[PDB]
Structure 1
Amino acid sequence: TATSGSCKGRCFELQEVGPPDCRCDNLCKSYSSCCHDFDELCLKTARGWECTKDRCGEVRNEENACHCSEDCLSRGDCCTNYQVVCKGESHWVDDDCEEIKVPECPAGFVRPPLIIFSVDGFRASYMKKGSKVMPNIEKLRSCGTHAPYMRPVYPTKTFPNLYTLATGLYPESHGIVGNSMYDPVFDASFHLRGREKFNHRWWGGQPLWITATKQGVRAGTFFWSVSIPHERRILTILQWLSLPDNERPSVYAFYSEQPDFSGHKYGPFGPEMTNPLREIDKTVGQLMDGLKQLRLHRCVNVIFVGDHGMEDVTCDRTEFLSNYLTNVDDITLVPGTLGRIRAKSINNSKYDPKTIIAALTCKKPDQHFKPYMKQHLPKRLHYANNRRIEDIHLLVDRRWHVARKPLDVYKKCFFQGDHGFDNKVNSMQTVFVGYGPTFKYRTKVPPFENIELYNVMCDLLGLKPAPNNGTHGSLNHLLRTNTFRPTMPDEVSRPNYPGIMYLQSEFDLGCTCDDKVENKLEELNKRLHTKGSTKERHLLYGRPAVLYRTSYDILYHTDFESGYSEIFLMPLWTSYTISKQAEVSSIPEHLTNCVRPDVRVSPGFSQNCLAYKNDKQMSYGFLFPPYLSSSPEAKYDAFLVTNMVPMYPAFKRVWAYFQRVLVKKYASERNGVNVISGPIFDYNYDGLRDTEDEIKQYVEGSSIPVPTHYYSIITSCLDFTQPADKCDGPLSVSSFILPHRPDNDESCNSSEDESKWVEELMKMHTARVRDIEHLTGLDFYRKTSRSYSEILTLKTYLHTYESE
């Protein structure tokens, strides 16, 4: 860099110039590339950040940081409080808030600008707990649209989350999977410190500023060099807002290192935390006062958003891999509030991940982390499908750290706070407030995930979003206008409706049943149950649509309905309703090993019992539980070969408990439940439905594919005074994606009775319906009385099982 060029008239230039020409942009300090005069011209500090009575009407001294002269408004370089001190105006916070029904912008403005005020480590509970010291932020919150909290992505670190906010993508898809990373294809590393993080090969997807530029919307630069003070960042944004209509950007970003920086040292609620919250609020006040001076305070949309929260973590709460592993020098550990382990050297052929996992599995009674092969991580975390995420992962308990050896903790107590844990943990939750003409007025919205904002910021700017992991329309309820009006995806495969086409004797399945037991009253009645008379009861929200090319059958029964796949030889889904009044019955002795041919489905597209006998590892279970049959005659339907699915005996303990106990418990507590359950196949852990040829495992000697997971979607009336089957209003849902595993090594207390561990496992693997759609290629809730945007919101809902 030949720094002999100048920054005269180029301060915070929006277009970056190429080396070895010197730079004057808001990033030049980070690349050590600024022109010699950058500090003098662009980082002026003289006389402070606020006008004073004496300075009012002064003679323009260009050296001053901000100006109090009469001409300053037209130059667009006044101090933010100029009109308060020198013209008797009020601070924006002291004004009563008034609905902004339409953009009230200066002439020339083609759209409301968007300003994103991002705050590092701004824990959700600070909005309540620090409300007395943050009046500007509290005005934004209460007069704008706010959520009680926003759910970050895993890992709940700064870079993964800022780039998820920028792109709408899960870290596995955008590539910033941690604050620290190794890419084995590049043979490069990425760190917070240093120069390799500036290379564009690390950064996938399309962040907002590129989406804007590519579509003719001009963007301020989002990144700010750490040395540039906050007051200067604000003044720069206000200066840009004063630019000519053909140069002025439409989207802007501010970033604060606080309260994260203090929160690390002092803990999330340390008494030292009050001051950082005062300064952030003061900065917001400066922005809104500056906007008001420029008559932009009822034109611009302001987003106040955080990347993650902050938890209490100290050095004494550190698990050391040295107290579990003998071989601790043959591994590399990405440490901290999560753990990622790989081999220290790829030439070491004695390195076995299986032995390492086993040595970290349930070894101490209070063990404050749990090891996982990455594909066994809860699917809600979507943290697997990247070569940068190590095969071995440690999910660390909230409040704790994992390190390799004790020397790493005392040769690196200092910190009292940290983050990075599971994104369902309360302490990791962060904030969202939207304020402006396109946002709603004094509106609370439910919690939502940060992956959803990319779309909304595209809507706010009139942009078409790049393909991302948001569900577009699920956050339309934040907006007065500029809503995106989505359509249901078209069904690709239509079902067959097979009647009775096969004789018992055509089947040679090795299956037996004790069912040779014999009337016109109840033969016409059961006929109509196989044509779909109780389908109104058991399929409450329409049949799910299959959104890919396949061959399947709708099978009707008294207690349940299924979409049976001829390719996978099992239901893709099974739907049934259990009212509050329904009764659990036992599986009778004569039917214990009963499997019956389904006369509507060919032998060739059926499973068989012989495969299950020959497979000593694999057993089988049922999607509609026999336990909940409506009558002894109806119970025979639950033993059909078309209701059967492959299950490991270790997983059957879980499934049986869910089906026998929990389904009824949920129907009691929620006033009936509709359950839709089924298999999932994700052998390549991309979070997406596997095609046939991706299946790595079959029931031995057969074409019966083995699920990697089993799902259920449990729906009822949000108004729980109405029964699930007759609900007039909004729905309530919770779902799960249980891993289909041949042991229960994940559950350290699995030797005990299922009532001590099963429900706990299901909670860990809670899921959004949208997760299940991605994984199955199905589309649920097709026929309701509710708006589609409300259904989209419901589909992205996650039941977290955390307290308030």
Structure 2
Amino acid sequence: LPPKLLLVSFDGFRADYLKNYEFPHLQNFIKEGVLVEHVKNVFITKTFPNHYSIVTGLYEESHGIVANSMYDAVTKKHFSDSNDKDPFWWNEAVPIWVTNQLQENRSSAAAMWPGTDVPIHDTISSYFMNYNSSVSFEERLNNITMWLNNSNPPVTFATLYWEEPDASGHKYGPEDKENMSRVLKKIDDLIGDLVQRLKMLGLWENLNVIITSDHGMTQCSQDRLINLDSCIDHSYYTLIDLSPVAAILPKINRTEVYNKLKNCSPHMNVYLKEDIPNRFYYQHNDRIQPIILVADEGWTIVLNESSQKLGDHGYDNSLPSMHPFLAAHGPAFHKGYKHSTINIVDIYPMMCHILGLKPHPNNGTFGHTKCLLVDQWCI
């Protein structure tokens, strides 16, 4: 009987949601498991880059998914959330489902996790779902758990992904407590459905389950806008990604573009690529454009017609508002332990340890996770 692990992400689950709303089902999951109250994720704090960091243990400059929208000047290739199936974009790293799939008599399974419908280094999970946001949580849940329960050879690593509370966090903004409370109650119910389902199938006691997320959300406002069209003409540059980290590809002298942009708003930092702060680990990749604009927390970079979005993320990964949480339950995990923080790149070496996989070189520190694990010294 090999170890099994289910990795679950509810997109956009800001850590402090746990302190401001009631999560009876999550509380239950935590009570007999472990909670990391907030996870320091990676810059930029967007969906595709952070999900890949979870499954590779790498910073974004290293795994190469540096935004939800990218342009590679050399190949002329474009990446976006919808247009995300060219392996070119995934192949700078090897995610854990691949390493798991490559072991004899083991399989990986997936239900909607970013990249799991793409062959990466020519390897795809035995079971996966082509991305389709219309597929209900129940269907994702019932299928991924069936696969974990049945399947020959055994499924030992599985992913499960859900688009909320990110989608509604964007719509309402995290400060809209009336509306976010209904969103998050639904998430807690889904976690309840997950636990009920594990108990029904007899998986609850032997399956390792991690419930986590990619980033948080912060409130945006009409009083906090930076309009690039009021600062620089379109002819000067091509916009690769917009807000709150704008990726700017100059059409003319980069110096001329930089001089305009650095005098646009005191509520963003304007960086030549080579001046991007080292703390972000967001420089050493050709997919990072010659200039980036980083808006301060709660500020939005806009064009004349950019639509309103009351919540957003992407900002500085040191901001608590951008941090997700992590919870876990199962034979590898202690019962009733709470820990303050780990880094999101630390999840990978922990998962490899649970599954008995040799990790690829990575930027995580296994030591940070030892207090969560039953076989490990906790200092």
Percentage of matched positions with identical amino acids: 36
8 Å contact from structure 2 (residues 166, 217) kept in 1: yes
Aligned with residue 2 of structure 2, among 111, 121, 131: 111
Tell me the residue number matched to 1:409.
306
- Deviation per CA, 1:121-170, whole angstroms, max 9, x where unpaired? 1000111111x2x2111122233111220111111000001111111111
Tell me the residue number matched to 2:292.
393
Q: In 2, distance between residues paired with 1:466 and 1:275?
A: 40
Q: In 2, distance between residues paired with 1:427 and 1:242?
A: 37
Tell me the residue number matched to 1:312.
219
Aligned with residue 238 of structure 1, among 133, 145, 157: 145
User: In the TM superposition, what is the alpha-carbon distance from 1:222 to its structure 2 partner?
Assistant: 4.5
Tell me the residue number matched to 2:107.
218
Letter paired with 1:232: E
User: In the TM superposition, what is the alpha-carbon distance from 1:363 to its structure 2 partner?
Assistant: 5.6
8 Å contact from structure 1 (residues 164, 451) kept in 2: yes
Aligned with residue 127 of structure 1, among 18, 29, 37: 18
Tell me the residue number matched to 1:605.
none
Q: In 2, distance between residues paired with 1:240 and 1:418?
A: 34
Q: Give the alignment of 1:351-370 within 5 angstroms.
A: 351-361=252-262, 367-370=266-269
8 Å contact from structure 1 (residues 230, 256) kept in 2: yes
Q: In 1, distance between residues paired with 2:368 and 2:41?
A: 16
Q: In 2, distance between residues paired with 1:232 and 1:294?
A: 15
Letter paired with 2:37: P
Q: How many residues align?
A: 357
Q: In 2, distance between residues paired with 1:181 and 1:314?
A: 26
User: In the TM superposition, what is the alpha-carbon distance from 1:316 to its structure 2 partner?
Assistant: 4.5
Letter paired with 2:96: L
Tell me the residue number matched to 1:55.
none
Q: In 2, distance between residues paired with 1:420 and 1:390?
A: 16
Q: Give the alignment of 1:576-725 within 5 angstroms.
A: none
Q: Give the alignment of 1:477-492 within 5 angstroms.
A: 477-481=371-375, 483=376
User: In the TM superposition, what is the alpha-carbon distance from 1:354 to its structure 2 partner?
Assistant: 2.1
Aligned with residue 284 of structure 1, among 191, 195, 200: 191
Tell me the residue number matched to 2:89.
202
Which ranges of structure 1 fall in alignment gaps of 5 or more residues? 1-109, 345-350, 484-786, 791-804
Q: In 2, distance between residues paired with 1:363 and 1:125?
A: 33
SS at match of 2:25: helix
- Deviation per CA, 1:41-98, whole angstroms, max 9, x where unpaired? xxxxxxxxxxxxxxxxxxxxxxxxxxxxxxxxxxxxxxxxxxxxxxxxxxxxxxxxxx
Tell me the residue number matched to 1:139.
28
The 10-residue stretch of structure 1 (450-459 or 208-217) with the greater mean CA deviation from structure 2: 208-217
Q: In 2, distance between residues paired with 1:335 and 1:295?
A: 46
User: In the TM superposition, what is the alpha-carbon distance from 1:237 to its structure 2 partner?
Assistant: 2.0
User: In the TM superposition, what is the alpha-carbon distance from 1:269 to its structure 2 partner?
Assistant: 3.2
Larger strand percent? 2
Tell me the residue number matched to 2:318.
424
SS at match of 2:246: strand
Tell me the residue number matched to 1:252.
158
Task: Report the aligned-residue RMSD.
Answer: 1.8
Of structures 1 and 2, the one scoring higher in RCO (CA 8 A, sep 6+) is: 2
User: In the TM superposition, what is the alpha-carbon distance from 1:287 to its structure 2 partner?
Assistant: 1.7
Tell me the residue number matched to 1:164.
53
User: In the TM superposition, what is the alpha-carbon distance from 1:377 to its structure 2 partner?
Assistant: 1.8
Q: 1:330 to 1:359 in 2, by over 3 A?
A: closer
Q: In 2, distance between residues paired with 1:419 and 1:446?
A: 22
Letter paired with 1:229: S
Q: In 2, distance between residues paired with 1:316 and 1:141?
A: 39
- Deviation per CA, 1:463-482, whole angstroms, max 9, x where unpaired? 1111111123332222111x
Letter paired with 2:312: D
Q: 1:234 to 1:222 in 2, by over 3 A?
A: closer
Q: In 2, distance between residues paired with 1:153 and 1:280?
A: 24
Which ranges of structure 2 fall in alignment gaps of 5 or more residues? 113-128
Tell me the residue number matched to 2:331.
437
8 Å contact from structure 1 (residues 338, 401) kept in 2: no
Aligned with residue 236 of structure 2, among 308, 330, 337: 330
SS at match of 2:262: coil
8 Å contact from structure 1 (residues 315, 415) kept in 2: no
TM-score (norm 1): 0.43
Matched, 1:466 2:354: no
Tell me the residue number matched to 1:451.
345
Matched, 1:261 2:167: yes
SS at match of 1:264: helix
Letter paired with 2:13: F
